[PDB]
Write a protein that binds this ligand. Structure first.
Ligand code: HEC
Length: 123
C-alpha cells in the first residue's frame, strides 16, 4: 500500500479544476469553447473511473483526509456514485455541443458532486 489519500486528493483537485472553465462559461465570464468543455468532461469521466480504487478501509484512520467513515458502511453506494458521475460526464460529451446545450445539460453532471459530498465528505 501507498499514500492513496494523497493520490485521490490530487485527482479530486484536478476534477475541481476541470469544472472551473465550465463555471466561467456559465457565468458569462469566458466565451463558449467546445474543445475546453469536452476536455473537462473527459477529465471528470476518467477521474471518476480511477477514484473507486483509492478508498481502502485501512486508510479510514489516515489523518489528512476529508473522507468520512460513512463511506465504509455504504461502500457500494459510494462506488456507484462515482460510476454515475462517470456515466453522466460521458453522456454529456455527446449531449453538450453548444452553449445552449451546456446550459440545459450541465446540471445533471455537476449535481453528482454535491450528492456525494453531502454524505461522504467533511463539511
Ligand atoms: C463521491 C462519489 C464523490 C464524487 C461523486 C465527487 N467527490 Fe469530490 N470528494 C469526495 C471525497 C470523499 C472527498 C475528500 C477526499 C479526501 O480524501 O480528502 C472529495 C474531495 C474533493 C475535492 C478536494 C480535493 C483536495 O484537494 O483535497 C475537490 C476539489 C472535489 N472533491 C471536487 C469534486 C467535483 C468538482 C466533483 C464533481 C464533478 C466531485 N468532487 C465529485 C467524494 C466525491
Amino acid at each position: 500500500a501507498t499514500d492513496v489519500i494523497a493520490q485521490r486528493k490530487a485527482i479530486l483537485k484536478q476534477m475541481g479544476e476541470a469544472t472551473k472553465p465550465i463555471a466561467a462559461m456559465l457565468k458569462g465570464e469566458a466565451k463558449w469553447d467546445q474543445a475546453v468543455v469536452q476536455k473537462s468532461l473527459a477529465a471528470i469521466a476518467d477521474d471518476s473511473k480511477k477514484l473507486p480504487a483509492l478508498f481502502p478501509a485501512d486508510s479510514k484512520t489516515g489523518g489528512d483526509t476529508a473522507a468520512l467513515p460513512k463511506i465504509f458502511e455504504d461502500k457500494a453506494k459510494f462506488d456507484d456514485l462515482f460510476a454515475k458521475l462517470a456515466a453522466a460526464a460521458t453522456a454529456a460529451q455527446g449531449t453538450i455541443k453548444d452553449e445552449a446545450s451546456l446550459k440545459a445539460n450541465i446540471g445533471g453532471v455537476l449535481g453528482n458532486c454535491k450528492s456525494c459530498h453531502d454524505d461522504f465528505r467533511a463539511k
